[PDB]
Design a protein around this nucleic acid. Structure first.
Lengths: 170, 154, 61, 51, 54, 222
RNA sequence: GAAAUUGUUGAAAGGGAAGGGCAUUUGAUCAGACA
RNA sequence: GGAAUACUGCCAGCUGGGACUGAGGACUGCGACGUAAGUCAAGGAUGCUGGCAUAAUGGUUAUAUGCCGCCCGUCUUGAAA
RNA sequence: AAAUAUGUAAGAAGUCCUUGUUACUUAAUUGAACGUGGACAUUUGAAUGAAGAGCUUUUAGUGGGCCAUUUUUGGUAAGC
């Protein structure tokens, strides 16, 4: 769905002889509140020894975008499980907000590389502040000064099954 | 799903299998009293009217003599649903009131000779609507020829 | 050829049921001698003044 | 003979629950709470906006 | 030849019940030296409850 | 004879003292629920001001709704589904949450969908689809005197008193829940939302735990 | 003087079957009720 | 520094259009409005009007059209074979 | 040394006191077994459920099975 980036905070268990377990937080892209609590215990089990029964969730917080209307260049690091052994991947996305770029990444991996939702691990999404270090090319061609291009051959969506004009393009 | 089986049947009877005319009058009378007087006596008698020939074994008149040997029960009007049969093994019989369906002519003579009167079930309800001061006896059932419901170890 | 623990643990728990009931008969108060299962825990204010929660960022490979 | 639903047919809603009359008089569902402008701490925001 | 397919389901139609655990278990099988005294123990304790306690 | 109007005038007057208990007690409930939610909202705001993280207490009442139909069910869950009175497809009961009943739902989790209900759905299930078991037979409520004749031993003598022992889980939760017949619910009016139901709700399906989205799904089935 | 089976007359249908189920059109035919 | 609005949630908030059903048969019950008589949408539909009084509705039967329909009996783990 | 599976216990036929029996037992009226009398009540001893529970007769058909998921054995293999 439309993803929402969340902040999930976890605290193992206040037990006798160890008060105050340390704390842990993560940034989770997910569709709703119920997934991102369960997606939190997916990663955080792999990093150290807790479980869902041995742990508890402190608080979740929805992080809205700091600047929606400003247009950003985003670099994403991706670890995905292919049919062979898994491997890294770095891709660059020119999009509007943080959580909208991950929307167009899961489409991009599914289209080109056939990776589903369950195979991909979003490593880190960072904003490239200055230009001219944009490494990929397809992001870079939109960065020239005074960019102008037409849209040739536009189609027209007709509501009637018959039209009498013998229609023409643009 | 179904936790229990299905349409079950309560295996108990609701009407007697007999086609006797006079017995259905007593079923008609006690279905009146059991619905209204609400004493627990009438439900015990009404269940006892539907029973077969085998579940109504004959209560011998020496067995009524045992029931009057109980302490503080010398004047209770004994109620038998089945038949009261004679028994010439005892000799001295009390004076109480017996209420039953059928009296054998030997047991008919022994109660009237002793002094007590013998009464049918319609005159029981006329005397005792709630069934106060009554005492129900039932005959033995395993004295019947049921020595034969079998197993390897008897 | 054995002997059992769990029953002897029940025999000790009956003694606990006697003394609680005998005490609560003296000072008028509720007994609550039936056991209960585990319960969901209550609300507790947790202060992150001691330790700042550190981000994880599941990179490694 | 016939089960008339509450939450419509307000006569049978007032058959039950006689508090439902005075619920509409004080209006009690669209209620404005007294606002308290209490700003959150600075430690919470710097882990929320940033990482 | 042999199988146990559909045998657990036939047992759980009329259920699997207990031997309904009566009061006063049958002393047949107990050590007879205990049985021989325990006869004479009850024969005395019915006397003193009838003679004295009344 | 007598009793022409002499007893009716007093019997109608006796109910006027009866309705007065229900009117003022529901006022005590409506004051409690609004002070319950204000104190939780104030607790998060007072914790953000002090820089602390106010966790919530775990919810203590779930609402289980059967999803899959009646056949091809293994013997281990099918006994557990009968213990929660969930016989037919699209049925529901309220379940107190302990260590014991959390493990029962953990067995039948590919068959049911459950979450934490609000006050709104509990008020709308009892009024529209609530039925009562009176000595057998599933009698619909439609009246307070029906509950008062059957749960008068336990306190409860109005229909909102039955709700208050459901959401604010009291000492008499078991006896007040077992008075309720299992709920009979339709198919959802909007749809299930998703193409396939028999995947987990984390994976887009319908069964599993969803913790708040039971309140959107029941109002369609209500 | 029954049925299989057949003759004439009368109606109706019909491009490699026929017969049947639910639903109506058209055509033939018919009972009931209105004091 | 001050807002607005999305999004989620609540209302025992208001109001308009469409469809299916009228089961029950003197009275009793629980109620709401009214100062009271009472009235009322409160334990299930009534009021007003028009056409026709016969093949008009309807029943039957023949055919037409849309979709569906392998041949019965038995043996069999399995029958259109 | 898991997982899944599996045995029992979660109280009335119970606990506690006083002391009654006998030919068994003890060095011993010490035990053991069953008791009289007295104290202990609906939170009477975990959850949920119970569309009654319990027992008894009497007989019908059947005693050629097959398929799938998973674990397996013989077989290269298989609708073996």
């Amino acid at each position: 769905a439309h993803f929402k980036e969340y902040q999930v905070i976890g605290r193992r268990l206040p037990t006798e002889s160890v008060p105050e377990p340390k704390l842990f937080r993560m940034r989770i892209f997910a569709s709703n509140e119920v997934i991102a609590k369960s997606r939190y215990w997916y990663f955080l089990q792999k990093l150290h020894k807790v479980k869902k029964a041995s742990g508890e969730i402190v608080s979740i917080n929805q992080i809205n975008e700091a600047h929606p209307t400003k247009v950003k260049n985003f670099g994403v690091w991706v670890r995905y499980d292919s049919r062979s052994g898994t491997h890294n991947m770095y891709k660059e996305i020119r999009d509007v907000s943080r959580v909208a770029a991950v929307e167009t990444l899961y489409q991009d991996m599914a289209a080109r590389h056939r990776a589903r939702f369950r195979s991909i691990h979003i490593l880190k999404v960072a904003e490239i502040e200055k230009t001219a270090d944009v490494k990929r090319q397809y992001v870079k061609q939109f960065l020239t000064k005074d960019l102008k291009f037409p849209l040739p051959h536009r189609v027209q969506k007709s509501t009637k099954t018959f039209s009498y004009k013998r229609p023409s393009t643009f | 799903d179904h936790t229990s089986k299905q349409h079950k049947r309560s295996g108990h009877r609701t009407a007697p299998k007999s086609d006797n005319v006079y017995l259905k009058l007593l079923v008609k009378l006690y279905t009146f009293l059991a619905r209204r007087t609400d004493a627990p006596f009438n439900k015990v008698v009404l269940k006892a009217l539907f029973l077969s020939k085998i579940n109504r074994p004959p209560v011998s008149v020496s067995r009524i003599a045992r029931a009057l040997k109980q302490e503080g029960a010398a004047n209770k009007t004994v109620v038998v649903v089945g038949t009261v049969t004679d028994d010439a093994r005892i000799f001295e019989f009390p004076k109480t009131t017996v209420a039953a369906l059928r009296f054998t002519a030997g047991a008919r003579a022994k109660i009237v000779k002793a002094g007590g009167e013998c009464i049918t079930l319609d005159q029981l309800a006329v005397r005792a609507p709630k069934g106060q001061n009554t005492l129900i006896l039932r005959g033995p059932r395993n004295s019947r020829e049921a020595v034969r419901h079998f197993g390897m170890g008897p | 050829i054995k002997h059992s623990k769990c029953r002897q643990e029940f025999l000790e728990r009956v003694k606990a049921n006697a003394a609680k009931r005998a005490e609560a008969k003296a000072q008028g108060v509720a007994v609550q001698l039936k056991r209960q299962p585990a319960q969901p825990r209550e609300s507790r204010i947790v202060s992150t003044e001691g330790n700042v929660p550190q981000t994880l960022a599941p990179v490694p490979y | 003979v016939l089960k008339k639903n509450p939450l419509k047919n307000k006569q049978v809603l007032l058959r039950l629950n006689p508090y439902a009359k005075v619920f509409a008089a004080e209006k009690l569902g669209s209620k404005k709470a007294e606002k308290t402008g209490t700003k959150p701490a600075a430690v919470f925001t710097e882990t929320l906006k940033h990482d | 030849n042999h199988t146990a397919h559909n045998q657990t389901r036939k047992a759980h139609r009329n259920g699997i019940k207990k031997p309904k655990t009566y009061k006063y278990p049958s002393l047949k099988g107990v050590d007879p030296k205990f049985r021989r005294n325990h006869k004479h123990a009850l024969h005395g304790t019915a006397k003193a409850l009838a003679a004295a306690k009344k | 004879a007598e009793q022409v109007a002499a007893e009716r005038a007093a019997r109608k007057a006796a109910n006027k003292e009866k309705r007065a208990i229900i009117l003022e007690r529901n006022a005590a409930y409506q004051k409690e629920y609004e002070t319950a939610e204000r104190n939780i909202i104030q607790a998060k705001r007072d914790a953000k001001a002090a820089g602390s993280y106010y966790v919530e207490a775990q919810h203590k009442l779930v609402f289980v709704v059967r999803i899959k139909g009646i056949n091809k069910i293994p013997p281990k869950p099918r006994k557990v589904l009968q213990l929660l009175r969930l016989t037919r497809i699209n049925s529901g009961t309220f379940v107190k949450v302990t260590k014991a009943t959390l493990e029962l739902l953990k067995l039948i989790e590919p068959y049911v969908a459950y979450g934490y209900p609000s006050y709104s759905t509990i008020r709308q299930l009892v009024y529209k689809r609530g039925f009562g078991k009176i000595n057998k037979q599933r009698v619909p409520l439609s009246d307070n005197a029906i509950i008062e004749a059957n749960l008068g031993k336990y306190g409860i003598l109005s229909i909102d008193d039955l709700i208050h022992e459901i959401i604010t889980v009291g000492p008499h939760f078991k006896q007040a829940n077992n008075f309720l017949w299992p709920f009979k619910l339709s198919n959802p009016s909007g749809g299930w939302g998703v193409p396939r139901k028999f995947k987990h709700f984390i994976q887009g399906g319908s069964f599993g735990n969803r913790e708040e989205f039971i309140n959107k799904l029941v109002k369609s089935m209500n």
